[PDB]
Amino acid sequence: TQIIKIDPLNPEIDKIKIAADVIRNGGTVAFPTETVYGLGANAFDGNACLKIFQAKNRPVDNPLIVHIADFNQLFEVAKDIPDKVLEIAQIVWPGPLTFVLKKTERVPKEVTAGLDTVAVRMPAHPIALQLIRESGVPIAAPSANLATRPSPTKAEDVIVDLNGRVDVIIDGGHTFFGVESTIINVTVEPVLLRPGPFTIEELKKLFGEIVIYKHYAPNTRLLLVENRNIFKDVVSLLSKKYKVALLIPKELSKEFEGLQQIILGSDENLYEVARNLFDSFRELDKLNVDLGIMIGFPERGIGFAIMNRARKASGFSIIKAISDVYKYVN
Ligand SMILES: Nc1ncnc2c1ncn2[C@@H]1O[C@H](COP(=O)(O)O)[C@@H](O)[C@H]1O
Ligand SMILES: [Mg+2]
């Protein structure tokens, strides 16, 4: 694998071209975006796209997201787009919002998992946008992590996961938001399939009528305490019988000094928490603890996405009342 260091804010076009040549030749390239790193291939090349599944060992029926750099490309992969959707796409892109649309005959089965629809988005990241532009083709790509690991948010995550399994890894720093793009299905009348950086607050203003057994990393048991008023007592109750790690905001560090902590960021800046979330899960598994205990965050703005990912990561081990603890531990 060729690891190429590229400036994320002012990418060296000659370096981008090296990766683009790989895409055009049917190879795979891991690249940063404003959400999480992606592993991509020529969206029109089914065989190339299968290499993505092979590198991640991803179940073949889990579809990819097609990344475009301009609207001419939108019409190459999607069709029968409602006028309102087109008008809105033109004001939210490039951005962390993915639209599920009706696909064209040019989109391979490998990309859509055989579905009649295709998920599309225009990434708001210079490296991603330039890579697509220089490649001259839309790039299909899911998150760039190995099957059972958290979505990668920094180059090191991708390297540890895919080095030796992909043709190119662009080392482009840490991703901006840290959580995957918001997904909205506009082929029905619309549904929010996944919360993300494009908040539901903003979505409802554009789409007022919007409708709101896989194991998610970490492998270490993880409890999510949504009620902050019982967090201290849940910790006291568990740290007595188990070696724990607390995923908390810096504001609560002093209250639990002595116990293993993984600082997510500040309560005054949820984007910081979102940026550090997946890597905090990776750290939890590197530590030698019986279980992780994460505190909840406000479900406003990106907080909704944070909690959505947190619930999934905890295998839905939500604690609202201290008595709930009985359900996920002795
Ligand atoms: N046609 C589609 N309909 C609904 N969801 C889709 C579709 N295509 C892709 N997706 C979503 O995009 C995800 C892959 O991108 P990623 O979450 O970054 O790995 C899939 O797992 C689905 O959750
Ligand atoms: Mg993924």
Side-chain angles (χ1 to χ4, degrees), residues 58 143 145 151:
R58 177 187 184 83
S143 55
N145 50 310
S151 295

Side-chain angles (χ1 to χ4, degrees), residues 36 56 58 62-65 100 111-112 115 117-119 141-143 180 183 185 193-194:
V36 302
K56 294 167 52 70
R58 177 187 184 83
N62 193 355
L64 310 183
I65 284 175
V100 172
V111 171
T112 68
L115 302 174
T117 56
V118 62
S143 55
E180 308 96 326
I183 302 179
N185 190 339
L193 298 178
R194 182 179 67 191

Side-chain angles (χ1 to χ4, degrees), residues 122-188 190-212 214-315:
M122 191 180 291
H125 190 296
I127 286 176
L129 208 61
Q130 288 304 326
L131 173 65
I132 296 162
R133 293 186 183 299
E134 288 301 320
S135 290
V137 298
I139 294 181
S143 55
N145 50 310
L146 258 186
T148 63
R149 303 184 180 178
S151 295
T153 56
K154 66 181 183 180
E156 188 51 53
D157 293 339
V158 184
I159 294 177
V160 172
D161 280 21
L162 306 178
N163 187 32
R165 307 181 63 80
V166 295
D167 298 301
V168 174
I169 291 177
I170 291 178
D171 179 346
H174 197 293
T175 56
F176 311 163
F177 295 112
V179 293
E180 308 96 326
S181 66
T182 301
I183 302 179
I184 183 181
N185 190 339
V186 298
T187 64
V188 293
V191 183
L192 177 66
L193 298 178
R194 182 179 67 191
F198 198 91
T199 71
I200 184 61
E201 284 90 338
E202 179 165 25
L203 264 180
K204 285 190 174 183
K205 302 289 76 180
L206 303 173
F207 297 103
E209 71 303 69
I210 190 172
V211 174
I212 304 180
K214 155 159 287 187
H215 173 287
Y216 289 90
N219 298 152
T220 297
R221 184 181 300 301
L222 176 68
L223 302 183
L224 180 62
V225 185
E226 280 175 40
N227 181 356
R228 292 207 171 191
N229 297 87
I230 70 171
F231 191 71
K232 183 174 178 179
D233 292 335
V234 169
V235 175
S236 296
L237 188 66
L238 300 174
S239 69
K240 199 71 179 61
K241 300 297 183 183
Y242 299 100
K243 183 184 179 190
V244 305
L246 315 183
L247 291 72
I248 53 177
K250 67 185 180 187
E251 288 70 27
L252 303 180
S253 180
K254 292 177 58 62
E255 190 59 56
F256 297 107
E257 47 188 61
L259 293 177
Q260 172 67 59
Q261 298 172 22
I262 301 176
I263 307 302
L264 299 170
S266 178
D267 272 325
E268 306 177 8
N269 184 183
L270 300 180
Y271 287 98
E272 195 168 56
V273 175
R275 290 187 68 180
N276 295 145
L277 189 65
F278 293 134
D279 278 352
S280 295
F281 296 159
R282 285 189 182 248
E283 191 189 331
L284 179 61
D285 279 344
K286 288 181 181 175
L287 294 168
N288 183 45
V289 296
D290 299 307
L291 64 82
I293 307 173
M294 182 176 157
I295 193 172
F297 289 86
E299 288 195 299
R300 63 152 183 282
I302 202 162
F304 195 68
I306 292 172
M307 292 303 286
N308 170 275
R309 304 298 189 284
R311 299 196 177 89
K312 294 174 183 173
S314 71

Side-chain angles (χ1 to χ4, degrees), residues 71 74-75 78-93 97-102 118 120 184-188 190-191 203 206-207 209:
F71 284 89
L74 174 65
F75 298 112
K79 63 185 294 183
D80 297 325
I81 303 176
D83 298 321
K84 180 180 171 176
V85 176
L86 186 58
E87 289 283 9
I88 291 172
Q90 291 173 284
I91 73 173
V92 305
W93 282 343
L97 178 59
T98 293
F99 287 96
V100 172
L101 311 161
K102 297 305 301 302
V118 62
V120 187
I184 183 181
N185 190 339
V186 298
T187 64
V188 293
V191 183
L203 264 180
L206 303 173
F207 297 103
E209 71 303 69

